[PDB]
Amino acid sequence: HHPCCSNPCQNRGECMSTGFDQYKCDCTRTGFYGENCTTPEFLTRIKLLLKPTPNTVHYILTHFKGVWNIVNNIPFLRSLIMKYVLTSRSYLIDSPPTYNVHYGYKSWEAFSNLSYYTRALPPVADDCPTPMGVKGNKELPDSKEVLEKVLLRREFIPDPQGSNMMFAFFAQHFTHQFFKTDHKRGPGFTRGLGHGVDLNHIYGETLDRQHKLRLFKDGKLKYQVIGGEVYPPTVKDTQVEMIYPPHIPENLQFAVGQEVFGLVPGLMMYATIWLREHNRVCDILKQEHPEWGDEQLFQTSRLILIGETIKIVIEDYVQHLSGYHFKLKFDPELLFNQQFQYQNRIASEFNTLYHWHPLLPDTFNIEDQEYSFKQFLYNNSILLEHGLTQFVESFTRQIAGRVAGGRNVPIAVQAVAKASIDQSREMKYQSLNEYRKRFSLKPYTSFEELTGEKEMAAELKALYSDIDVMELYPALLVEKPRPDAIFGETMVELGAPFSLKGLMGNPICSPQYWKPSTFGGEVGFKIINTASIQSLICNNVKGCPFTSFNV
Amino acid sequence: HHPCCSNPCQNRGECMSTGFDQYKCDCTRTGFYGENCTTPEFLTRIKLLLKPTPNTVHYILTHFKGVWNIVNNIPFLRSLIMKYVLTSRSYLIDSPPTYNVHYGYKSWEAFSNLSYYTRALPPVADDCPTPMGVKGNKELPDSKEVLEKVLLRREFIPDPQGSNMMFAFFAQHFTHQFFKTDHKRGPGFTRGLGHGVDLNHIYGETLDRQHKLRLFKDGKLKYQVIGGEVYPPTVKDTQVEMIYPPHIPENLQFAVGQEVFGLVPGLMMYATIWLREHNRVCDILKQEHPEWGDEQLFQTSRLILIGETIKIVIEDYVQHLSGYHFKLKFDPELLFNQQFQYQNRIASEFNTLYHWHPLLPDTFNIEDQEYSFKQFLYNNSILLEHGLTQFVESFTRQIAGRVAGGRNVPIAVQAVAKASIDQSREMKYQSLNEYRKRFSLKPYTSFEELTGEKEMAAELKALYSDIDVMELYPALLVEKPRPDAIFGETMVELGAPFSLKGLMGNPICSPQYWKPSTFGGEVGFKIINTASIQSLICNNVKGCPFTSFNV
Ligand code: COH
Ligand code: COH
Ligand SMILES: *[C@@H]1O[C@H](CO)[C@@H](O[C@@H]2O[C@H](CO)[C@@H](O[C@H]3O[C@H](CO)[C@@H](O)[C@H](O)[C@@H]3O)[C@H](O)[C@H]2NC(C)=O)[C@H](O)[C@H]1NC(C)=O
Ligand SMILES: *[C@@H]1O[C@H](CO)[C@@H](O[C@@H]2O[C@H](CO)[C@@H](O)[C@H](O)[C@H]2NC(C)=O)[C@H](O)[C@H]1NC(C)=O
Ligand SMILES: *[C@@H]1O[C@H](CO)[C@@H](O[C@H]2O[C@H](CO)[C@@H](O)[C@H](O)[C@H]2NC(C)=O)[C@H](O)[C@H]1NC(C)=O
Ligand SMILES: *[C@H]1O[C@@H](CO)[C@@H](O[C@@H]2O[C@H](CO)[C@@H](O)[C@H](O)[C@H]2NC(C)=O)[C@H](O)[C@H]1NC(C)=O
Ligand SMILES: CC/C=C\C/C=C\C/C=C\C/C=C\C/C=C\CCCC(=O)O
Ligand SMILES: CC/C=C\C/C=C\C/C=C\C/C=C\C/C=C\CCCC(=O)O
Ligand SMILES: CCCCCCCCO[C@@H]1O[C@H](CO)[C@@H](O)[C@H](O)[C@H]1O
Ligand SMILES: CCCCCCCCO[C@@H]1O[C@H](CO)[C@@H](O)[C@H](O)[C@H]1O
Ligand SMILES: *[C@@H]1O[C@H](CO)[C@@H](O)[C@H](O)[C@H]1NC(C)=O
Ligand SMILES: *[C@@H]1O[C@H](CO)[C@@H](O)[C@H](O)[C@H]1NC(C)=O
Known part of the structure; x- marks a missing residue:
């Protein structure tokens, strides 16, 4: 071997x-x-003694509110700490990318072929005497058994951080632009060749798709008006391929950038909100540039929305998840005198850790109705019956589930969770502890140390035998969460660097793009640097309802 | 407008x-x-006062030959100056790239679409009152007139720097991996989607082509043996598409990575040499790694050859062109504490400036034969009859033409030269003086200043009227050359920054790739770091004939 x-x-x-x-x-x-x-x-030995652990830094960031109150209001200081936050997680992502499912050594195929997800760790070799290499049993435990014993929800466990359904659908809408697994080829392959925040989930992955979704007037996207409300156009009107069951009314077959978004009315909510935002920015740019044509208006609005998306993800979305008293800041200038690569490649392991299916509730509570999964799926009439306004008001109030801590995966999505285990194995993922070391974390020495608990630990011990062969995906969902947190340490320490790379690595963050002229003047530049989840809903949803990512 | x-x-x-x-x-x-x-x-004013001109720097580097002989022998000093050489031309290139032929403003389409050549300067707007902007006449002078008056060769003018045919064909072979204009789409479009030194001209642009060219044993490429000599395989053997006129017999239709390399036996000479080098390196790696499979052997050989190419290009090719007494160095480590982007996008203008057709002789002199263009083109029998050893010996002896200085484009390729002017125009290139200011050079105040001569300047005055509408391409060919040099200032100052980006921007130069393990250990690494044009020929050509890029 x-x-x-x-x-x-x-x-x-x-x-x-x-x-x-x-x-x-x-x-x-x-x-x-x-x-x-x-x-x-010698120099390393010193650095290692002086470096605080992630759990220590997290404590400091989630305490001393008096200190952070001062920091958040002295702009020079806020920038200085944000600079630390950004650069601390910069030595951790291979960029240019290296490994993939088919290449455990560097190769030109792995570098140049954009169809693959990249890999933060090389696969376990084909002929290893054991699934994880050399330790553990000849076979890993049955994945159904892992799923049932430690993953599936018995009782709904609410997110102590207070994440709502606005957060949960935002997460799903956002990530589905860059996690687009090419199932025809295999789990190690993506259809998202832009490898990041290109808003293809709004605009389409190909030029053919974009041009079918565009109005070709005033930079705008095609739309329809139903009961005075602006919604995405139909499949019939646009000839845009979408995933829908045969039994769906023509007008409810909405065509949007990402083909799978008709699946969930919650995803359509964001698709509609973003479509409106694009057309709204078109209106602003037309006023500012009566001389511009349709092509420049479209392209400039797109760049602005990319900017908006990144601003919201850092300052509202990541901010919420972090639980920090410190206010995170989206500011590309902070890297201008640093060593940073303005490029990105999506990691398979990033896809894997982002399987936050425990966020999902048992029912979807809108107005006075309580929809089950069966009736909520593929059912866009729910969106039109209640309206975008009531969707926002309802989803802002409904708590999402805890991700870490074990046993919180809704049984309706049991097949997806089993698949995450099985596909991890197909892609020859290394063990939890190998990934922990890869991201500068101490390996877990026992199962009880992983869970911070006794019962699930015992079940995992009897299934895996050795902590060094525990798998990554199930470990993220059973991990001892931070104090009153949604996530454990492993989720944040793996997730933050992939995120930083995907957000700051975008070309619009580079010195040559980060200029008012890129965005049609100071007015376009202003839209970006004023964007919030609240302003997005306020500007595009009738009656400007209050919203946030927490109940 | x-x-x-x-x-x-x-x-x-x-x-x-x-x-x-x-x-x-x-x-x-x-x-x-x-x-x-x-x-x-204020800082800018101080920065301008203290910054030497390109001509001053050039003088220094090509004089004081006694001082440079010292500096070349102190590793620390050599590293310091080579670092200065690299960094001084770094702020000059947009990375990530910006404009292209269809986009004079930044857009996601221009950023993300690899089918375009990028643009160092935005195109002149479609509706401008004048071809170059607002200056000059309504029409540019007839391209045929520009060609005939100042570009076409009367006497052959030899390169005073002594460039040989080994150099002319190396230039043609090397650059044709990244200059692969998509003539179906237009001159603004490329088929080289790797946008640099990926060696697709040896291995093929697509995985289909690669797989048809590979032996699938020992990491090697397919080949044939003729008279005990190793040559590339045939179209019939591989089923690989090549561009050959119909009258070319089956056995003379060599299949190589680049489909146009059958055009010139000078190109087939390098294709055969590089094919031999790849299989040589496979043999070495197999000895170091009896345990490796075909796939790892192929991929590692490719990365080694990429390294070899970059090494040879910098230390033999660019060294020769420079005329510097300072010995240039290929060392990725020099950029490790610098701000540099490991990425490249081929610029349309890099392509245009590289149309060095004055290098070509009137006649191709092999052994005691003197082949015309008509005789040389598409004729691989010439290669098989004389052999690679004689080709190398002959091409090493035969001098190339001066590029700058005017009137040296061979009549045989006049249509090509006219197409360069014509296509610059349909791609809406800005003027020479605009390109000079873009690259931090003082604009030419007169045609006499451009040529450093009276006769051609007068001709150009009559054709263009205004120095500020003088075109870039013809200017490069008529420009006053540096003292005893092949090129003038514009060629070097525009060319060098594009070159740095294509060479150092390669992923193998990044800190995660630049390690012995990437190349199969210390032996593979040493092949890259000791590569040269003489070693390339010596290792792969019978008798090991002496060679270089001069005399
Ligand atoms: C971010 C949180 C989140 C949420 C709230 C969510 C909500 C839901 C949901 C109910 C609303 C349903 C019915 C599904 C259904 C699926 N999800 Co998610 N998913 C989420 C995160 C993800 C991610 C990330 C992937 C991987 C995407 C990929 O690989 O294409 C995923 C994969 C899947 C897959 C397998 C691949 C595919 O077909 O795309 C199915 C099926 N699921 N999901
Ligand atoms: C580097 C120096 C060099 C040399 C020595 C050289 C030698 C020769 C040669 C004799 C051996 C012949 C028969 C040709 C013939 C051609 N060359 Co070159 N060419 C060179 C640099 C280039 C470049 C660069 C291009 C653009 C190629 C592309 O974009 O595909 C080019 C373009 C062409 C074209 C396309 C015409 C157009 O529309 O632009 C033809 C035909 N020519 N060339
Ligand atoms: C990126 O990597 C992909 C996986 O390696 C690759 O797809 C693969 O492409 C090859 C060759 O095009 C296919 O193999 C072919 O082999 C013969 C043809 O002689 C046929 O019998 C097969 O049916 C097939 O066409 C693989 O099937 C295919 N693998 C897949 C889809 O998983 C991509 O080509 C690479 N991308 C690029 C742009 O190079
Ligand atoms: C990159 O840009 C080119 C230029 O527009 C695209 O080529 C066009 O594609 C459309 C839609 O498929 C065709 O109708 C046109 O005929 C093409 N124009 C040409 C050939 O000049 C190309 O599709 C783009 N690439 C990607 C990946 O989207
Ligand atoms: C900036 O440049 C513009 C255009 O180059 C200048 O505009 C004018 O320049 C001259 C000075 O007034 C005028 O005589 C011209 O009519 C006008 N140029 C054109 C092409 O219309 C302008 O002066 C410059 N501004 C500054 C502050 O120097
Ligand atoms: C680092 O590499 C490991 C290789 O896994 C280690 O080798 C093995 O260590 C085991 C536990 O100590 C031994 O039981 C096993 O026999 C041993 N294998 C050997 C020596 O071939 C190396 O000892 C270690 N090297 C160093 C220098 O620390
Ligand atoms: C700019 C982002 C980088 C660092 C921010 C600092 C700490 C991260 C804190 C919490 C994030 C929690 C888990 C990380 C995993 C996924 C979130 C990434 C969001 C995304 O970009 O899709
Ligand atoms: C993808 C493109 C990448 C690399 C191209 C490499 C080499 C091209 C060679 C020369 C570029 C053109 C003109 C420069 C001429 C002489 C260089 C001498 C001055 C110097 O750069 O030190
Ligand atoms: C609803 C999800 C559970 C479906 C059947 C349970 C699968 C067996 O799993 C068992 O579940 C018990 C109850 O949580 C636990 O006490 C055991 O530790 C666990 O092994
Ligand atoms: C021998 C040097 C010629 C001096 C340059 C100006 C004359 C070039 O003129 C052109 O020459 C071409 C060569 O065949 C012909 O095809 C064209 O008909 C002719 O106009
Ligand atoms: C779809 O939603 C409507 C309300 O909008 C609901 O009454 C109906 O039962 C749902 N249909 C299905 C097939 O579940
Ligand atoms: C090709 O080269 C051979 C020499 O090997 C020469 O005799 C012949 O004339 C050439 N072919 C043509 C048609 O030019």
Whole structure:
């Protein structure tokens, strides 16, 4: 078998076979040397002693409110701390990207082929005597058994951080622009070739699709008016391929950027809100530039909405998730004197960790109705019956579920969760503890340390035997959450760097793009730097209802 | 007409219309302010006073040969100066890229669509009152007239720098991996979607082509043996599409990565050499790694060859062109504490400036034969009859033509030269003086200043009227050359920054790739770091004939 199967190389060292029975570690720039890259250079030893742990930094960020009150109001300071926040997680993502499901060593195929998700860790080699390499049993536990014992919801566990259905659908709408698994090819492949925040879920992945969705007048997107309300256009009008069951009324077959968005009225809510936002920005730009044509109006509005999206994700969405007293800031200037690559490639592991199905409730509570999954699926008439305004008001009040902490996956989505386990295995994912080390975290020494609990720990112990072979995806959902948090440490420490890269890596954040002229003048630039989840709903939903990501 | 037609914004300020008759300049980070970004800030004024001109720097580097002989032998000094060489031309290229032929403003379409060549300067607006903006006559001079008066060769003018045919064909071979104009779509479009040194001209642009070219044993490429010599395989053998006129017999239809390389035996010479090098490197890696499979062997050989190419290009090719006494160095590490983007997008203008057709001789001299263009083109029998050893020996001896200095384009390729002017025009290229200011050069105040001569300048005066509407392409070919040099100032100053980006911007130059493990260990790494044009020929050509890019 492959001599690297045991993952001997530590601290980001790279393993390479040298003959059938031998390996060498390459410790270049790791800060370590020795056969396994385990011996610290002097400078490294100092850095390691002085560096605070993620749990310590989180404590400091979620306490001392008096300090953060001052910091948040001194702009020079707020910028300085945000600069630390951004740069601390910069050495952690390979960029240019490296590995993929088919390549456990660097290759031009892995670099150049955009159809693959990239990989933060190389796959376990094909011939390893064990699923995770060398430790554990010959077979991993039955995935159904893992799912049922420690993943499936018994009683609904509410998010102690107070996440609402506005947050849950925002998460799903946002991520589905860049997690677009090409199931025809396999779980290691994506259809989102832009690899980030390009708003293809609004505009379409291809030029053919975009041009079918565009009005070609005033930069705008096609729409229909139903009962005085602006909604996305139909499949029939646009000839735009969408996923719908045969039994759906023509006018409820909405055509939008992402093909799967008719699946959920909650997703259509955001599709409609964003469509309106685009057309609203078109109106503003036309007033500012009566000289501009349709093409420049469209393209400029698109860049602005990309900007809006990133502003909201950092300052409202990530801000909410973080639980910090410090106010995070979207400001591209902060990296201008740093070393940062303005590029991104979506990691398979980012896709995996983002399977936050425990967010979903048992019923979808709108006005006085309580919709089950069956009746809520594919049913856009619910959106039109209640209206966007009542959707917002209802979803702002309904609490979402806790993600970490175990046993909170709705049984309606049990097949998706089993698939996450099975697909992790198909893609030869390394173990939880390997991923923890990869992201500078101490490996868990027991199952009880993982869960911070006794019952699920015992069930996991009997299923896996060894903590070093525990799988990543189920570990994220059973992990001991931070104090009164939705997530555990592993979710945040893996998730933050992928996120930073996807948000700040966008070309509009680069020195040559981050200029008022890029966005049609100071008015366009202003739209971005004033955007909030509240302003988005206020400007596009009748009656400007109050909204937020928390109940 | 477009308010920005006059190109009012200076010092890299961005122009934007505000109403039908008004414009506004964006001076962000230019170091300038004022309506047209012309009045400098204090630090800028100090920065301009202390900055030497390109001609001063060029003089220094090509004189004091005794001082440079010292500096070349102190590793620390050599590294310091090479670092200065690289960084001084870094702020000059938009990365991530901006404009293209269809977009004079920044857009997601221009950023994301790899089928376009990018643009260092935005195109002149469709409705401008004058071809170049507002200056000059309603029409540019007839291209046929420009070609015949100042571009076409009467006597052959040899390169005073001594460039040989090994150099001419290396240039043609190398650049034709990234200059692959999509003639179906137009001159603004490329088929080189890797946008740089990916070696698709050896391995093929698509995985289909690669797979038809590969042996699938020992990492190797397919080949044939003729008279004990290793040559590329045939179209019939591989089923790989090549461009060959119908009269070319089955056995002389060699299949290589780039479909046009059958055009010239000089190109087939390099294709064969590089094919041999790949299989040579496969042999080495197999010895170091008896345990590797075909796939890892192929991929690792590819990364090694990419490295070899970059090394040879910098230390032999660019070294020769420069005429510097300073020994240039290929060392990715020099950029590790610098702000640099590991990405590239091929610029339309890089393509245009690289139309070095004056390099081509009147006649191709192999052994005691003197082949005309008609005889040389599409004729691989010439290669098989003489052999690679004789090709190398002959091409090493035969001098190339001077590029700058006017009147040196061979009549045989006149249609090609006329197409360069014509296509610059339909792609709406801005003027030479605009391109000079974009690259921090003083605009030419007269045609006599451009040529450094009276006769051609007078001809150009009659054709263009105004120096500020003089076209870029013909200017490069008629420009006053540096003392005893092949090129003038515009060629070097525009060319060099594009080159840096294509070479150092390659993923293998990034810190996560630049390690021995990427290349199969210390042996593979040493192949990259000791590569040269002489070693390339020595390793792969019978008898190891001496070679270089001069004499
Ligand atoms: C962010 C939170 C979130 C939510 C609230 C959510 C809500 C729901 C929901 C009820 C409203 C249903 C019926 C589904 C149904 C599915 N989801 Co999600 N999903 C979520 C995060 C994800 C992500 C991320 C993926 C991976 C996308 C991919 O790989 O294409 C995913 C994958 C899936 C898949 C398998 C791949 C696919 O077909 O796209 C199904 C089926 N699911 N999901
Ligand atoms: C680098 C120097 C160099 C050399 C030595 C060279 C030598 C030769 C040569 C004899 C060996 C022949 C028969 C040709 C013939 C051609 N060359 Co070149 N070319 C060179 C640089 C280029 C470049 C660069 C292009 C653009 C290619 C593209 O964009 O596909 C080009 C374009 C062409 C075209 C396309 C015409 C057009 O529409 O632009 C033809 C035909 N020519 N060339
Ligand atoms: C990115 O990676 C993809 C996976 O390697 C790759 O798709 C694969 O493409 C090859 C060749 O085009 C297909 O293999 C073919 O082999 C023969 C043809 O001689 C046929 O018998 C097969 O049916 C098939 O056409 C693979 O099927 C295909 N693999 C998939 C879809 O998973 C992409 O081509 C790569 N992308 C780019 C742009 O290079
Ligand atoms: C990149 O841009 C080009 C130029 O527009 C696109 O090519 C056009 O595609 C449309 C829609 O499929 C065709 O109708 C046109 O004929 C094409 N124009 C041409 C050939 O010049 C191309 O599709 C774009 N690439 C991507 C990935 O969207
Ligand atoms: C900025 O540039 C513009 C255009 O180059 C200048 O506009 C004018 O320049 C001359 C000075 O007034 C006028 O005689 C011209 O009519 C007009 N130019 C054109 C093409 O219409 C303007 O002066 C400049 N502004 C500053 C502050 O220097
Ligand atoms: C770093 O590499 C590992 C390889 O996994 C280690 O080798 C093994 O360590 C085990 C536990 O100590 C031994 O039981 C096992 O026999 C051993 N295998 C060997 C020596 O071939 C190396 O000891 C270690 N090297 C260094 C220098 O620390
Ligand atoms: C700019 C973002 C980078 C760092 C922000 C600091 C801390 C992150 C805090 C909480 C985030 C929680 C979990 C991370 C996982 C997914 C969220 C990423 C959001 C996204 O970009 O899709
Ligand atoms: C994808 C493109 C990437 C790399 C191209 C590499 C080399 C192209 C070579 C020269 C570019 C054109 C003109 C420059 C001429 C002489 C260079 C000498 C001055 C110098 O750069 O040090
Ligand atoms: C509703 C989700 C559970 C479906 C059947 C339970 C699968 C067996 O799982 C068991 O569940 C019990 C109840 O939570 C626990 O006490 C056990 O620790 C667990 O192993
Ligand atoms: C021999 C040097 C010629 C001097 C340059 C100006 C004359 C070029 O003129 C052109 O020459 C071409 C060559 O075949 C012909 O095809 C054209 O008919 C002719 O107009
Ligand atoms: C769809 O929604 C309507 C209310 O808008 C509801 O009454 C109906 O039962 C739903 N239909 C299905 C098929 O569940
Ligand atoms: C091709 O080259 C051969 C020499 O090998 C020469 O005799 C012949 O004339 C050439 N073919 C043509 C048609 O030009």
